[PDB]
Design a protein around this ligand. Structure first.
Ligand SMILES: [Fe+3]
Ligand SMILES: [Fe+3]
Ligand SMILES: [Fe+3]
Ligand SMILES: [Fe+3]
Lengths: 510, 384, 162, 384, 511
């Protein structure tokens, strides 16, 4: 006996701000330099039920897409081998990033005092759970239906053999949750998301489509549909701490540290995975990097925060100076260490060499010469008895690991930054690749104690390390990682054992 | 426009020329190394377990080495120092409902859409015409409205758990429990707004229920207990266990089931029980996960079962007294109902039902010695 | 030799198995933390194994404490019998009186080394972590980039190798 | 294995070489010639309207000529002779809920899954301990169970319409209404089975409720009305109208809202109201549809408004007496309740609520002169 | 608290569905029927309304998520051969009408059944047929929204009423399903319709579509296919329930034979025409497919299984074999001759298709290929030629008739198949028949068959007037929906058709 009536999410969110009540111990449980205001609002007026409905619609579309049309089309098989190998690393590393984003957003939700800011953070927490499961499902699907399951099916335990995993862990695991909650927000939301993760997702969809992959676009566009709320969350954090003198004291320091942290790893790794892990090229990494950092983030996004005192990072000039050759050097080092990965890597072919030379003049005389020498020595042939690390050792080109960033570097052979800093403190020696990480460590040494692969594996034979960490395929002899992407002449653990390659700590020579 | 490798003839031809004849590995199961709780591995376990990059020094971790970056002063990103409970493997916990994000949102979205349809049907049917005015004006508006702050505090108690959980399975479970808590609070507010819409003179502002929560007598000790559980507990395991296995199980169960779910029908209020049904479904769903985590995995741990049981009994002793105090204070809500709504016998029987359910489900699973007569006598001190 | 299992871990497990009293177990855990777990550690011998051995000692000490104490003591005392609240308040006061960032770092690191659980109850220890970390971050991040790398190297007392 | 045109290089090359530069037509709307009820043509309208291949001699058809094959004796596959009501266009009806098959099954599946979750919570929560044994054993088992046969007969009253309806929109609406009726009957049976599961000694066999329905006194005239509405009406429009706008709206509304939805909660029964809520939601949806079909389209027909109103008033007068008799017989169920359960004032008020709702919603839309006092007094004549 | 979590599933409720019906005097079917469906007849699938809704919802969600996300991103709606786009117009619309009339037929069967379980099976089929109607409608909707040629996809429901193939389609999937005895309607729909043609036809269509770059049709039609086990069970249960009534031994064989002839008479030529002529890449000759469908699949396994209730193979089966070899080639000759009356674009066979036809149908060339080459030389694809193949038909004295019963057009003087014509004058009107079975159907049941053919409705009207009046034009307002080719330029307009000066005549006025 009335008009049919219902209450929507907005009419309930209208009264959410009043939910929190004041008592003596109503404060954040974590250490922080900033005081978040308690009148902060959120751009999106969501309740638990409405958020569930929104996410369920997207999930039904993506999973109906994956289980009917993409499966019927063999879309998981008809993908270039190089891109299939690349998606292992990309999907698993994004999965770890989203997982640690869950914990980071939980810490942020603890920090916030306004109920609306808390609601936004909780929505992002559920979203990061969704994104974790989506990336895990990309690996799941490519394992069930892909042309090579190894690495997709056991990435969560084979990630731990290779060196790139430590840097990935720092950027998307420890940089997200370890430190001031505002600093963690800057790493995750203000810098990690606005600068890298979102354009990363879009560009990954572009490159995956170029290489016959339709599973990655299907999952990652659905992932990216959730990013407006997270960008709003980062903006809300910066707004909520903008009225505190602690902001004027510390916010620019935190933002610069977060920017350098993220860029130091996402400059070389992303470009290397794109340009060397793909057959069909979409765009040189230098142009994409310049557009992402100087155009989209450094110019527009950071400019939007000028009213709250946020300044452009002071290390942006250094990042640009070092961003030209970083991924080529990182790929040299990563191919030299192919046995330690959980993916198959391919040497550049003639077409790829010509594309590299066209887009990066001077690339050949250094990188192409090295790669052609490696190929002429049989880096791809198991009977050759050669892994490029042998070439590094013969030519007196040590490979170090940055104590802070965990990124491998070869200062005596790099084209980009070629500075090495070694310090001895309390019976230990630490090697740094730049001034910013060196300052980070000198300022707070106790935060940076991760052992690198050369210390954990010091004095151990490579085959023993690979065997112990389960780096083998189902047959028990063939390695997950290979120096090529063809289906024949795969390297076995006996091939690695015949080399007799024993890990050494490069710093002992000092 | 854009050429795709799956459909473009040239790119497709190159890709097909590069492909191998057969897959390079016969093991097409992601997470084949995960130990299955049931007959064969599920998608929940394939997609969830081992997503957290723990090292071996955190029980059950597969990685090695220290954390790359820690807190100022050396606090690890995750560590065994953040909880009292010890385990041989933190990844052993499995949610019995086996719900990862997709099923969870699917269920909650179904509930939301059915709620919308029901509200439209209730408004069009004019069933508000049979609800008692006094019950709607005082008890739905003020006290049922005041319970949403209790649910909201219980929800906020999950923050340090969502940050500190040492396992991805446990983290997902904790996040789902907290999200259900906030959902219950928002459903209480939604019912108040619906009543405001379909009843002239009904004020949906939270000022009256919030004043009852922060300044009344019925919810004084409940509010104190919620504040303690929320902001005075830095142990995520203690927070979750005490919220779900001690405080919620007794006080929230009595309030939702033995007062509102029981006395609302006597006043023609079929609207409050509709949302209390959802709250009870959420509670019974979360109970299975709570028991699996704290009794199947930690309480029955092959090497730390006795120690974990000692710690959990300690927590029960710590948080049972404030729960009994909250129940005793809430007993004063019976002095406000119209005379004859219920007698002391019905109240005593409901209290015994709640306490017996608690002892069977929770107290006895850790060897906690609880006297049902003692507890009910203590609680009834606030009635007569 | 092994990443996850080796002779050092086995020997330390055997050594741990023979602690029977809570006093000896707590003393061993404290000495281990002083010797092997911080940048200020006395030696880097166990660098590849110290975290796992520390976890094993922590488990043993936690079990022994739970056995030895009652509920109130297990909630409010450290393994050495001190009142956790008094220790926490004293450490927080010392941090609040800290003059510069070097003293603050020393205080926070020493607190972590000496009172990390299961030596101290988790509630008290994490509250102390909250307050001490707030203070230390406030002191450290003030004028972060003003000191040149040469003077910062001198202040940290590092030997420049290359 | 198979080579697909979309992905195969050579086949795809041929297909692409054959493609034109732009679509041959700029009109990419699949129902552009349908007159939209709302601003823009909806997906439901596009997928439904004009699916029936009616010729122009059936009001609104777009085809020409006679049916290719007719019945023995020559009666058409579809024809105007199968209903009394006339109209200028049988495709004018729109379901106000914009409800084609996909959304319909989506909603029903949501409700099914939510019901399963609620039942699991209700059983695990032990809420049966509060239900009155006499209400459960005597009224849930026998009389609520006896109502499932009324719902089944109302469901079966829709076969004539499902075969004879003269447009796709009307056919889909009638089919959905009938499916909802059968769903309610099955939900009654499902509740009885659930109680048999969680209440030892409860018998889920339909022998007792069926004996009550076919040989009892309270459901006698209701059974006679259902039989007449089902097997003695050969007019699909008469079946739908009399079922949904006369008999259901009064008798079923009183039985669901004013006896079970009202008295079940008084006996600690929060289970029956759970299903009666779904029944009421279905009723309100069907009521929107029925009002749109018979009052907005046929009753307000620009050319046959008066004639259709006369026909529907005749049907209302014809089927109101059996409905009043069904209510009068069902009145005898009030003397079987425990003394003090309800009194004459409440019964009279509930009867007046149902009658006034019917007069507002249905009787007044066709100018049917109904005396509320006369109807209520007639129904109360058999109160004892 | 205190109990174990418990629930009730569809089976535990279905266990008591058989008792829902009660006995009263007027509990009987409302429709004329020779048979008596016995009560106490059980159904194979234990379903209740909500469980059926859940299982259909899963499929719907999967299918629509596939269509809205990956197939739209891949542009799969455009990258389809033009011939298959034109073919899908007809296929989707005609199957949609079949499903829609199946809704009413199953409603009639639900009225007929007396057991609550048989009623439940029929009701589930009713809801399924609604689902399939909306699914075919959605195939047309998607191809109109996203395809290369929306016209015909966007108005098939009113532009189908111009051409002659629509009349026969209506008889098979519209009037055959609902007009007549309920058991006869079931035999047309379930026992023969679905089991013999529609069931295998859906999978065959998905095969031919996939071969032609079409991914929308497989996506929708495989989901449609997932439902047909229950419908086959419904047909089996119908035959079982009427098996013990003495009327079965009298009438079941006659009804089955009439239903089989009704279905085959239309689907033998039409399906072959649509498959072979409306596609670029061929999956299989229609002769082999038909032969497998009718004798190895349906007339064998299926009718062999049913024979234990007195069912026997149709007596017209040999005649169907005799007439099925060349049926679809003749039908396409006629259908192309009347291309202006369609709502789809047709094309002549090209060189590879002509060689494929001559390889799979020896002798196909000298007749059909030579006629098509004559037409192509006459400029049948050039709007400035002023030639439509109907002009050649009239010139060479090859009149086209329309079967009074089946509505299938035929040219006896040119057909390689039946070639038999019957003309009777009864009560001032002349009727033309192409077979003995339809002639007997009309002689026994004259008042059941009275449909006016296109030559009677259009008698004396100029072709352009008919096309314009029925809205057979594109959104331009002058270009026709139907074309004699599938190219993107040189499309015919209403002015060309008007210049032809083609005026319909009644072929039976010559007698
Ligand atoms: Fe994310
Ligand atoms: Fe994000
Ligand atoms: Fe169908
Ligand atoms: Fe069917």
């Amino acid at each position: 006996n009335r008009a049919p009536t219902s209450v929507n999410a907005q009419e309930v969110h209208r009264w959410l701000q009043s939910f929190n009540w004041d008592f003596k111990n109503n404060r954040t449980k974590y250490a922080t330099k900033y005081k978040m205001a308690n009148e902060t609002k959120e751009q999106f007026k969501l309740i638990a039920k409405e958020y569930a409905r929104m996410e369920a619609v997207k999930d039904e579309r993506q999973f109906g897409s994956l289980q009917d049309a993409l499966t019927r089309l063999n879309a998981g098989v008809r993908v270039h081998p190089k891109w299939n190998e690349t998606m292992k690393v990309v999907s698993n590393f994004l999965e770890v990033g989203e997982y640690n984003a869950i914990a980071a957003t939980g810490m942020l939700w603890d920090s916030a005092q306004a109920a609306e800011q808390k609601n936004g953070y909780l929505a992002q927490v559920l979203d990061e759970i969704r994104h974790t499961h989506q990336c895990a499902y990309v690996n799941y699907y490519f394992a069930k239906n892909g042309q090579d399951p190894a690495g997709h099916n056991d990435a969560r335990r084979t990630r731990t053999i290779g060196p790139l995993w430590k840097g990935m862990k720092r950027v998307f695991s420890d940089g997200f949750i370890s430190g001031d909650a505002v600093e963690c927000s800057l790493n995750l939301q203000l810098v990690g998301e606005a600068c890298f993760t979102n354009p990363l997702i879009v560009a990954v969809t572009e490159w995956a489509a170029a290489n016959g992959d339709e599973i990655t676009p299907t999952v990652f566009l659905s992932i990216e549909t959730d990013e407006l709320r997270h960008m709003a969350n980062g903006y809300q954090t910066v707004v909520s701490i903008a009225n505190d003198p602690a902001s004027a004291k510390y916010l620019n320091t935190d933002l610069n540290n977060a920017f350098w942290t993220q860029q130091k790893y996402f400059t070389p790794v992303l470009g290397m995975l794109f340009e060397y892990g793909s057959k069909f090229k979409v765009e040189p990494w230098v142009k994409t990097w310049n557009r992402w950092v100087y155009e989209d983030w450094g110019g527009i996004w950071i400019g939007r925060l000028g009213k709250y005192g946020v300044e452009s990072p002071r290390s942006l000039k250094d990042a640009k100076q070092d961003a030209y050759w970083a991924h080529h050097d990182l790929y040299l080092l990563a191919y030299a260490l192919w046995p330690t990965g959980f993916f198959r890597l391919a040497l550049p072919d003639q077409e790829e060499m010509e594309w590299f030379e066209a887009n990066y003049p001077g690339w050949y005389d250094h990188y192409g010469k090295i790669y052609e020498e490696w190929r002429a020595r049989g880096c791809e042939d198991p009977s050759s008895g050669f892994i490029p690390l042998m070439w590094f050792i013969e030519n007196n080109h040590p490979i170090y690991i940055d104590r802070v960033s965990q990124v491998p570097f070869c200062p005596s052979l790099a084209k980009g930054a070629s500075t090495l800093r070694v310090h001895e403190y309390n019976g230990q020696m630490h090697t740094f690749s730049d001034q910013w990480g060196e300052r980070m460590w000198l300022a707070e040494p106790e935060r940076y104690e991760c052992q690198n692969i050369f210390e954990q594996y010091e004095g151990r034979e490579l085959s023993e390390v690979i065997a112990e960490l389960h780096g083998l395929r189902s047959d028990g002899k063939t390695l997950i990682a290979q120096p090529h992407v063809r289906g024949d002449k795969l390297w076995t653990l006996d091939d690695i054992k015949r080399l007799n390659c024993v890990f050494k700590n490069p710093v002992k020579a000092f | 426009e854009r050429r795709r490798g799956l459909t473009d003839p040239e790119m497709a031809a190159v890709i097909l020329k590069a492909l191998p004849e057969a897959p390079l590995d016969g093991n097409n199961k992601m997470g084949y190394f995960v130990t299955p709780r049931w007959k064969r591995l599920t998608e929940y376990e394939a997609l969830t377990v081992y997503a957290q990059p723990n090292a071996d020094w955190i029980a059950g971790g597969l990685d090695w080495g220290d954390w790359t970056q820690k807190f100022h002063g050396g606090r690890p990103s995750w560590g065994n120092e953040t909880t009292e409970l010890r385990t041989v493997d933190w990844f052993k916990h499995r949610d019995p409902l086996r719900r990862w994000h997709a099923p969870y949102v699917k269920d909650k979205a179904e509930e939301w859409r059915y709620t919308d349809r029901f509200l439209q049907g209730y408004s069009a049917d004019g069933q508000i015409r049979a609800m008692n005015p006094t019950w709607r004006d005082e008890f739905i508006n003020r006290y049922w409205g005041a319970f949403l702050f209790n649910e909201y505090g219980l929800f906020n108690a999950h923050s340090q758990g969502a940050r500190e959980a040492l396992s991805d399975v446990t983290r997902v479970s904790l996040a789902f429990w907290g999200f259900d808590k906030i959902d219950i609070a928002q459903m209480i507010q939604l019912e108040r707004g619906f009543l405001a819409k379909i009843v002239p003179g009904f004020d949906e502002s939270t000022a009256v229920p919030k004043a009852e929560w922060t300044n009344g007598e019925v919810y004084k000790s409940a509010r104190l207990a919620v504040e303690g559980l929320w902001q005075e507990v830095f142990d995520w395991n203690e927070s979750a266990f005490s919220v779900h296995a001690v405080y919620d199980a007794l006080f929230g169960q009595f309030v939702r089931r033995e007062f509102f779910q029981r006395l609302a029908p006597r006043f023609g209020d079929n609207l409050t029980p509709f949302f209390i049904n959802q709250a009870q479904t959420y509670f019974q769903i979360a109970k299975q996960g709570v028991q699996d985590l704290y009794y199947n995995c930690l309480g029955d741990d092959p090497e730390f079962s006795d120690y974990n049981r000692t710690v959990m009994r300690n927590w029960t002793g710590k948080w049972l007294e404030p729960t009994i105090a909250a129940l005793r204070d809430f007993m004063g809500l019976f002095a406000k109902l119209p005379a004859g709504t219920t007698d002391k016998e019905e109240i005593t029987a409901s209290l015994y039902r709640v306490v017996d359910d608690w002892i069977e489900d929770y107290a006895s699973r850790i060897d906690f010695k609880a006297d049902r007569d003692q507890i009910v006598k203590a609680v009834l001190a606030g009635l007569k | 030799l092994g990443i996850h299992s080796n002779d050092t871990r086995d020997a330390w497990v055997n050594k741990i198995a023979q602690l029977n009293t809570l006093e000896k177990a707590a003393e061993m855990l404290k000495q281990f933390r002083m010797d092997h777990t911080t940048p200020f550690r006395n030696s880097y011998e166990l660098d590849n194994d110290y975290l796992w051995i520390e976890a094993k000692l922590e488990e043993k000490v936690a079990v022994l404490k739970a056995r030895a104490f009652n509920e109130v003591d297990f909630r409010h005392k450290t393994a050495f019998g001190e009142d956790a609240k008094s220790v926490l308040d004293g450490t927080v006061a010392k941090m609040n009186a800290a003059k510069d960032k070097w003293e603050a770092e020393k205080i926070h690191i020493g607190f972590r080394q000496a009172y990390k659980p299961p030596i101290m109850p988790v509630n008290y220890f994490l509250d102390g972590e909250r307050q001490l970390g707030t203070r230390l971050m406030e002191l450290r991040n003030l004028n972060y980039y003003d000191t040149p790398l040469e003077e910062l190297r001198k202040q940290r007392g590092v030997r420049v190798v290359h």
